[PDB]
């Protein structure tokens, strides 16, 4: 499985192009490429032009640009809202560190008879229609992506999650373990499955959160504060569709969100809190404290200096399911020149992230739903870190090659 990321640096664009050209004409010499990648670690101060190319496959045209001087902070965004699709991650399964993560996850769900790998390796179009399947798979993949990133020594300066994403976030913050985090996905899924709730629904709507609060029919609530003029509403299905229709009729923006007839982050879920709280309290014994890096979207800023806030307990994670997603409010804290990575099997939030952030923020997705080959895509993403001054050596992602 030849494909490699090559990164380059130099005091002139032409230096980098020439460099990339050489790697291209030595595509199959891994010892050589590994060397080139070690070389590229050079301050913009010294060598203000950086470039990259993914050798193997064809998103492989080179990218070169001038890097600006200085420190840029790295931010992890973990998506959650339904980023599932038939064949997630088989793409990335070629990276041993990734495959090893997922198998390590399988270990956590060996009981309950579920193989996340079997799930991903599956080929049934209905396979991810199951809530528990999706939930675990989503979180599995996020952990994998996190592990890939961490192997290149990438420590995030800030972490922000969205619904289920706050589980991944815990893992990223080193609050939850792989075992802990994966079961959190499982139980959250299982408790819901078992509940057999009425028919619910959710919808993205181009009103303000306040306007949403006011204009909302009874039983239908604002659920996710995605941006300043985008909010996902949530409640019993009948009225959710009725609302989205009236809204379209009057030229507001209004896109259904597939969620399996479910009203998440609403009173509906309140039913499932006590069972979930039970199970999770078993899984997260001696809960760990959350760091200042990890901004919470379940709890609002004002009650952050708080006990529920203090740690990522079963109490914290149950609250997440019930409480609304205060995402935009967290985004407000991401600084001006942040590099931001969407950690998710699909980059659903790219739109909202771009919208709720500034030209000087750089936003990098790591996977695209149904992409020809997500390794290429992910590698490209890693290339983009280079172009943005972040030091991330791809050599780490592949087997070593010393002494030819």
UniProtKB/Swiss-Prot annotation:
Cellular compartment(s): Cytoplasm; Melanosome
Binding residues for an acyl-CoA: 229-230, 253, 355
Residue positions of the active site: 163
Region annotation Acyl and malonyl transferases: where it falls in the sequence: 11-399
N6-acetyllysine modified-residue sites: 18, 110, 255
PTM entry text: In adipocytes, S-nitrosylation of Fatty acid synthase occurs under physiological conditions and gradually increases during adipogenesis.
Expression across tissues: Ubiquitous. Prominent expression in brain, lung, liver and mammary gland.
Record PTM Phosphoserine, positions in chain: 307
Something else known: The relatively low beta-ketoacyl synthase activity may be attributable to the low 4'-phosphopantetheine content of the protein.
Subunit structure: Homodimer which is arranged in a head to tail fashion. Interacts with CEACAM1; this interaction is insulin and phosphorylation-dependent; reduces fatty-acid synthase activity.
Name of the protein this chain belongs to: Fatty acid synthase
Annotated source species: Homo sapiens
């Amino acid at each position: 499985q030849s494909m490699r990321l090559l990164r380059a640096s130099g005091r002139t664009p032409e230096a980098v192009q020439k460099l990339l050209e050489q790697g291209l004409r030595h595509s199959q010499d891994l010892a050589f490429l590994s060397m080139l990648n070690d070389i590229a670690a050079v301050p913009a101060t010294a060598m203000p032009f950086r470039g990259y190319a993914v050798l193997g496959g064809e998103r492989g045209g080179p990218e070169v640009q001038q890097v600006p001087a200085g420190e840029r902070p790295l931010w992890f965004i973990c998506s959650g809202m339904g980023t599932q699709w038939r064949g997630m991650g088989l793409s990335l399964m070629r990276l041993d560190r990734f495959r090893d993560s997922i198998l390590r996850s399988d270990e956590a769900v060996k009981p309950f008879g579920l193989k996340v790998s079997q799930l991903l390796l599956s080929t049934d179009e209905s396979t991810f229609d199951d809530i528990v399947h999706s939930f675990v798979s989503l979180t599995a993949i996020q952990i994998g992506l996190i592990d890939l990133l961490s192997c290149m020594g990438l420590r995030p300066d800030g972490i922000v999650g969205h619904s289920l994403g706050e589980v991944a976030c815990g893992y990223a913050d080193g609050c939850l373990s792989q075992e802990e985090a994966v079961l959190a996905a499982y139980w959250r899924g299982q408790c819901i499955k078992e509940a057999h709730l009425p028919p619910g629904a959710m919808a993205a709507v181009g009103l303000s959160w306040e306007e949403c609060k006011q204009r909302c029919p009874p039983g239908v609530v604002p659920a996710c504060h995605n941006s300043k003029d985008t909010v996902t509403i949530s409640g019993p299905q009948a009225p959710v569709f009725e609302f989205v229709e009236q809204l379209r009729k009057e030229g507001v923006f209004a896109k259904e969100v597939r969620t399996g007839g479910m009203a998440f982050h609403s009173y509906f879920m309140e039913a499932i809190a006590p069972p979930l709280l039970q199970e999770l309290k078993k899984v997260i014994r001696e809960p760990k404290p959350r760091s200042a890096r990890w901004l919470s979207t379940s709890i609002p800023e004002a009650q952050w200096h708080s006990s529920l806030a203090r740690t990522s307990s079963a109490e914290y994670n149950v609250n997440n399911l019930v409480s609304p997603v205060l995402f935009q409010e967290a985004l407000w804290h991401v600084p001006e020149h942040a590099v931001v990575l969407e950690i998710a099997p699909h980059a659903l939030l790219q739109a909202v992230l771009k919208r709720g952030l500034k030209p000087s923020c750089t936003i990098i997705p790591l996977m695209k739903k149904d992409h020809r080959d997500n390794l290429e895509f992910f590698l490209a993403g890693i290339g983009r870190l280079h172009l943005s001054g972040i030091d991330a050596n791809p050599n780490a992602l592949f087997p070593p090659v010393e002494f030819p």
